[PDB]
C-alpha cells in the first residue's frame, strides 16, 4: 500500500552497487562456474594421464584400498583343489612346482555393454558350472548371512581344465585350456551351453599349452601360447589353420601380450624364459600363410637391477601384460623385480620406466616375490591384480599418476590358501557402481571384498569422467 513511497526509497539504484560487487567477485565466480558441471573433465583426464606417463612414482603399502564385506563357509564349492589325477596330472604337478604354469580355475562372463554377470567354476571331474552372481553382487551387508548361489547350468568337459578365460569383448564366448587341448563354449542367456567347439593346436611332443588370450578389441581371434610357439586363429572363418604362427629361436616362451600402434594394427610382445623381451608387428609378412615366423627383435631396457647374467635377464621373466587403459606394459622377472614401461606407439621404444619394489608387511622378506597373472578390473581404470609366482598371495596395485598403492589381500583365518582371483565392477541396489572382488581358496570358501570408493575411485570422479 506504499508503492510510490517504495519507488521513492528505491530511487537510489542498487544496480551500481550490484555491478560493483559483481565485477570483483567475478574473479572467483568465473573459476567456480567453469569448474561446475563436467566442464574440463576431458582436459583434466588428459592431463592426469600425461602426468601418469611422465611423473615418477614410488611404491607404498596399504590396506584401506580394499575392504572385506562377506565370507562364505567352508565346503560351499566341491573339489576346488585339483588332485591332478591322470597321466597328465603328474606333468601338471611338475609344472606347477616349477611355477611355469599357473592354474586359473574360474572365470566371469560379463561385458561392459552386456547384462551378463555369470561366474564359471571348474571342477576336477571335467565339469564347469555356470552360476548367477546377481544375488551375491546385490548383497552388500557385512553380516554372516548364508550365501545363496543359483546354479545356472553345468557342462562336462572331456579334458582337465587349467585355465578358464571369458572373452572380454563379448561375454558370450568362454575358452577352456588344459595341458594339451582347447575348447570354446558359446553360452545362452540362461547360462546353458548353446555351442561347443574344439580347437586343435597340433602340439608337438614335449610342449604344453600355456594359455589362450583373446586379441583385445577383437571377437573371434584367439592366440594360443605354449612353451615354444604361439598360434593365432580367427574363429569367424577357420579353427584348424591359424592365421599367425610365431616361434622363438632360442629358449622357451614364458608369456605373451598384445597392444596396438598409432595406426591401430596389433603388435605382439613375447617375453621368454631367457629374460629377453621381443616384439613383432603382425601382418601378411609375419602371417602363417607364409609359414612360421621367428621373432628376432629384442627390447633394450637398461637398468641397474636389470643385469644380463649368463644370457638371462634377472634369471628369467615371469609374466608380461600391457594395459590398454593405461597405455603401458607391465612385466616382471624370476628374481622378483617388477617394471612398468611406457613405450612409444610408433618407434616401439620404452619412453619411461617405473620400478615396482614390493615391500612385505613383515621385514623378514627382503626380495619382492615375482609377479604373475595380471588382471585389470573392467570399467575400473588404474586397478590391477596380480599373484605371486612363488607364494601365490594376491596383490592389488593402483597406478596413481604419482604413486603406486599396493595392498596384499590376506584372509583371516590364514588356513584358506587363496587359489584364484576375480574382480568385477557392477551396479548396486542404490544404482551405485561398486567393484566387488571374489577370492576362491583351496577349501572352497568364497571371500567377498569391496573397493573403497574414497580410495579406489580417483579416475571414476565426475571431474575426470565425461558426462
Amino acid at each position: 500500500g506504499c508503492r510510490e513511497e517504495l519507488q521513492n526509497q528505491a530511487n537510489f539504484s542498487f544496480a551500481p552497487l550490484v555491478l560493483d560487487m559483481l565485477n570483483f567477485l567475478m574473479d572467483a565466480i568465473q573459476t567456480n562456474f567453469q569448474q561446475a558441471s563436467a566442464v574440463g573433465s576431458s582436459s583434466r583426464a588428459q592431463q592426469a594421464l600425461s602426468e601418469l606417463h611422465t611423473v615418477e612414482k614410488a611404491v607404498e603399502m596399504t590396506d584401506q584400498l580394499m575392504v572385506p564385506t562377506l565370507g562364505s563357509q567352508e565346503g560351499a564349492f566341491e573339489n576346488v583343489r585339483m588332485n591332478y589325477s591322470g597321466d597328465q596330472g603328474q606333468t601338471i604337478r611338475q609344472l606347477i612346482s616349477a611355477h611355469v604354469l599357473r592354474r586359473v580355475a574360474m572365470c566371469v562372463l560379463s561385458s561392459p555393454h552386456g547384462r551378463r554377470q555369470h561366474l564359471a567354476v571348474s571342477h576336477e571331474k571335467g565339469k564347469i558350472t555356470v552360476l548367477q552372481l546377481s544375488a551375491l553382487l546385490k548383497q552388500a551387508d557385512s553380516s554372516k548371512r548364508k550365501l545363496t548361489l543359483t546354479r545356472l547350468a553345468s557342462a562336462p568337459v572331456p579334458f582337465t581344465v587349467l585355465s578358464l578365460t571369458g572373452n572380454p569383448c563379448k561375454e558370450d564366448y568362454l575358452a577352456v585350456c588344459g595341458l594339451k587341448d582347447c575348447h570354446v563354449l558359446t553360452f545362452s542367456s540362461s547360462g546353458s551351453v548353446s555351442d561347443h567347439l574344439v580347437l586343435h593346436p597340433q602340439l608337438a611332443t614335449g610342449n604344453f599349452i600355456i594359455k589362450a588370450v583373446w586379441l583385445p578389441g577383437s571377437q573371434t581371434e584367439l592366440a594360443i601360447v605354449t612353451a615354444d610357439f604361439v598360434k593365432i586363429y580367427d574363429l569367424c572363418v577357420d579353427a584348424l589353420s591359424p592365421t599367425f604362427y610365431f616361434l622363438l629361436p632360442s629358449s622357451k616362451i614364458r608369456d605373451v601380450t598384445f597392444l596396438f600402434n598409432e595406426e591401430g594394427k596389433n603388435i605382439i610382445v613375447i617375453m621368454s624364459s631367457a629374460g629377453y623381451i621381443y616384439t613383432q608387428l603382425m601382418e601378411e609378412a609375419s602371417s602363417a600363410q607364409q609359414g612360421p615366423f621367428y621373432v628376432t627383435n629384442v627390447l633394450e631396457i637398461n637398468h641397474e637391477d636389470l643385469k644380463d647374467s649368463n644370457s638371462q635377464v634377472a634369471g628369467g621373466g615371469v609374466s608380461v601384460y600391457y594395459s590398454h587403459v593405461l597405455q603401458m606394459l607391465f612385466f616382471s622377472y624370476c628374481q622378483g623385480k617388477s617394471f612398468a614401461a611406457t613405450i612409444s606407439r610408433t618407434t616401439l621404444e620404452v619412453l619411461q620406466l617405473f620400478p615396482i619394489n614390493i615391500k612385505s608387511s613383515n621385514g623378514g622378506s627382503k626380495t619382492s616375490p615375482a609377479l604373475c597373472q595380471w588382471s585389470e578390473v573392467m570399467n575400473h581404470p588404474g586397478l590391477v591384480c596380480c599373484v605371486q609366482q612363488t607364494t601365490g598371495v594376491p596383490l592389488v596395485v593402483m597406478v596413481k599418476p604419482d604413486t603406486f598403492l599396493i595392498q596384499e589381500i590376506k584372509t583371516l583365518p590364514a588356513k584358506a590358501k587363496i587359489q584364484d582371483m576375480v574382480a568385477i565392477r557392477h551396479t548396486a541396489c542404490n544404482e551405485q557402481q561398486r567393484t566387488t572382488m571374489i577370492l576362491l581358496c583351496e577349501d572352497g570358501s568364497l571371500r567377498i571384498y569391496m573397493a573403497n570408493v574414497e580410495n579406489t575411485s580417483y579416475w571414476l570422479q565426475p571431474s575426470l569422467q565425461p558426462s
Binding site: 544496480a15 550490484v18 561446475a36 561392459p112
Partner: protein, 216 residues
C-alpha cells in the same frame, strides 16, 4: 538451492538486478542498462549452471522492449564467441574438446531452430561463402577419425564423439536451415551431404538419411 555458494550469490545478484530494473526509476535503469546487459551477455557466454543462464536471459529479455533486438544481441554475442573459438582451434590445429564441441553444437541447433534467418545473417556476415560450413564439417570429420574404431581399445578417456546420432542430426539441421536461407553455397553442401552418406558407419549414414527425411 543446494548448489555452490558463489552460484547462489550470482542468482541473488541477478534477481537484485531484476529488482533494480523493475522497481527503480527510469533514469538509473537507462544509465545502467549498458553495463547490465554486457555483464549478462558475458555470464551467458561462459559455462555455468542452467539456472543462472535462465535468469540472465530473463533479465536481458526484460531489459529490451522488443524481443527481436534482444534475441539478435544474444545471437551475435554467442555466435561471435563460437566463431572466434572455432577459428582459433582451426588455426592452431588442436583437437577440440568433445564438451565444448557439444556445447557449440547444441547452441547452434537451438539458434537454427528459432531463427535460421538471423543465424545465416550473422554466421555468413563478413567479420568464399559458407566457409563456416566447411570448417565445422572438417572439425566433425577430424573428431570422428580420432574416435577409436573399437570402444574396447579406448583408454579411460574417450577421444572422439560419444553421441554420434545427436551430433549428426544437429549438423544436418544446421545445413538444412542454411540451405533454406542461403542458396549459393548449396553446391558445397551437397558434397558434404554425400560425404556423410558414403561413410562406412551405418549409425551416421542412416542417421543423416532419416534426418533428411524428417526435415525436408
Amino acid at each position: 538451492t543446494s548448489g555452490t555458494v558463489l552460484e547462489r550469490l550470482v542468482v541473488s545478484s541477478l534477481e537484485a538486478l531484476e529488482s533494480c530494473f523493475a522497481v527503480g526509476p527510469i533514469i538509473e535503469k537507462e544509465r545502467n542498462k549498458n553495463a547490465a546487459q554486457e555483464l549478462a551477455t558475458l555470464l551467458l557466454s561462459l559455462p555455468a549452471p542452467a539456472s543462472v543462464q535462465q535468469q540472465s536471459k530473463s533479465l536481458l529479455a526484460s531489459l529490451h522492449t522488443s524481443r527481436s533486438a534482444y534475441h539478435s544481441h544474444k545471437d551475435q554475442a554467442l555466435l561471435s564467441k563460437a566463431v572466434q573459438c572455432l577459428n582459433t582451434s582451426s588455426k592452431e590445429g588442436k583437437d577440440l574438446d568433445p564438451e565444448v564441441f557439444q556445447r557449440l553444437v547444441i547452441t547452434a541447433r537451438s539458434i537454427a531452430i528459432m531463427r535460421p534467418n538471423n543465424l545465416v545473417h550473422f554466421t555468413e556476415s563478413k567479420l568464399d561463402c559458407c566457409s563456416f560450413i566447411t570448417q565445422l564439417v572438417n572439425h566433425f570429420w577430424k573428431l570422428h577419425a580420432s574416435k577409436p574404431k573399437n570402444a574396447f581399445l579406448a583408454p579411460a578417456c574417450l577421444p572422439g564423439l560419444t553421441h554420434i546420432e545427436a551430433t549428426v542430426n544437429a549438423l544436418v539441421d544446421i545445413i538444412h536451415g542454411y540451405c533454406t536461407c542461403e542458396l549459393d553455397c548449396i553446391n558445397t553442401a551437397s558434397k558434404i551431404y554425400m560425404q556423410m552418406l558414403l561413410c562406412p558407419d551405418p549409425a551416421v549414414s542412416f542417421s543423416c538419411k532419416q534426418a533428411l527425411i524428417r526435415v525436408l
